[PDB]
């Protein structure tokens, strides 16, 4: 469980993530890695 990865797709189909990993980059990209 991460802090971004529990909010947006909690749970996901392999053709999911992949549209969810744009969205995903939008929501934390570099934040330090914090």
């Known amino acids: 469980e991460i802090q971004l990865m529990h909010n947006l797709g909690k749970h996901l189909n392999s053709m999911e993530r992949v549209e969810w990993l744009r ?7 570099n934040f330090v890695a914090l």
Do not use: P, T
């Not at 969205?23 to 990209?29: R, S």
């Open 23 to 29: 969205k995903k980059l939008q929501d934390v990209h």
